[PDB]
């Protein structure tokens, strides 16, 4: 046993991590950086041990030698006696979401429209839709496809950041952390909800979790699921209840990564921390809930039931799967 130093991305995660640190009696402590890429460099330097990453960022971390440790597991759809920690993960569905009232927008008419992305380099927000678009258009000029976008982590003066809003004060426009109003799954879906954009690239669960009273958050509390449609790759639009037949890809769940030399320790500490603070952990809700943050998905997604053990001690390529890896590789050829 040593202490595990977690890396928080931006100040809202830093505050949650400090609460966790306090509750864990400094079994976990906190390092903080402004972007996920900077947290990954902190882990490579050995100045932090671990953080939880979207698959696109697991690709970056894994090219640098970091390894997957445990994966987010949300509620299974299909029955299982299996304990959450031992259950195989079922990826999530990457979708393209639009307003029902924006009639006649389909997959085939996205050129020159306004788009909302979780962040450059993330799976559902970026790698899957821009990979598909580069391929279908035969051009690497994916920075000129949409007329304007919010794609946190792109050049703040470029059209890919034209729609980003920055923080409370309008500072930090387009930074890829939760201070940007339109960052991440919930930020990109808010960008669509507010009709800042015409299309949001998020995951199926985002739409459900921020509609029909599922969020009380001020911009979401009044949104109705029937006012949204999914874009299918065949050019059709479906209701958001049809994501199993109308998605862009199945994504590998977000997962914790660490240096190889610290993975075993990180895994043990985390399994013990979720026993205390995870979904009905000994001390959640009374002292601290590791997987809650009032819908902001800070450190972990709010829909996480547990962090689950991986089968086969996978390398990052085995975890992401060979198809997704080659999709990312192909897209990164553009820049």
């Amino acid at each position: 046993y040593t202490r595990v130093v977690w890396c928080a991305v931006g100040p809202e995660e830093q505050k949650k991590c400090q609460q966790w640190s306090q509750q864990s009696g400094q079994n976990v402590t906190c390092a903080t950086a402004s972007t996920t890429d900077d947290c990954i460099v902190l882990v490579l330097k050995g100045e932090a041990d671990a953080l939880n990453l979207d698959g696109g960022y697991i690709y970056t971390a894994g090219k640098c030698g970091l390894v997957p440790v445990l994966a987010e597991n949300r509620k299974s759809s299909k029955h299982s006696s299996l304990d959450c920690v031992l259950r195989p993960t079922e990826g999530y569905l990457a979708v393209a979401v639009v307003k029902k009232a924006n009639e006649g927008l389909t997959w085939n008419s996205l050129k020159d429209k306004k788009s909302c992305h979780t962040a450059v380099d993330r799976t559902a927000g970026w790698n899957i839709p821009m990979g598909l678009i580069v391929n279908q258009t035969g051009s690497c000029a994916f920075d000129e496809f949409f007329s304007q976008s919010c794609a946190p982590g792109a050049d703040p003066k470029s059209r890919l950041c034209a729609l980003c809003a920055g923080d409370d004060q309008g500072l930090d426009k387009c930074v890829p952390n939760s201070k940007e109003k339109y960052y991440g799954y919930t930020g990109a879906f808010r960008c669509l909800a507010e009709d800042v954009g015409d299309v949001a690239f998020v995951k199926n669960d985002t739409v459900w979790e921020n509609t029909n009273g599922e969020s009380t958050a001020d911009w979401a509390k009044n949104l109705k699921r029937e006012d949204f449609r999914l874009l299918c790759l065949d050019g059709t639009r479906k209701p958001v209840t049809e994501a199993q037949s109308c998605h862009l890809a199945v994504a590998p769940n977000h997962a914790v990564v660490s240096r190889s030399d610290r993975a075993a320790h990180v895994e043990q500490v985390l399994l013990h921390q979720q026993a205390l603070f995870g979904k009905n952990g000994k001390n959640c809700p009374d002292k601290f809930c590791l997987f809650k943050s009032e819908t902001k998905n800070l450190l972990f997604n709010d829909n996480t039931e547990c962090l689950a053990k991986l089968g086969g001690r996978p390398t990052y390529e085995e975890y992401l799967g060979t198809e997704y890896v080659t999709a990312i590789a192909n897209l990164k050829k553009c820049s």
């Binding site: 890429d37 460099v41 490579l44 970056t60 090219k63 640098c64 590789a329 990164k332």
Partner: peptide, 6 residues
Amino acid sequence: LEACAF
């Protein structure tokens, strides 16, 4: 394909 980005 190649080296670490950093």
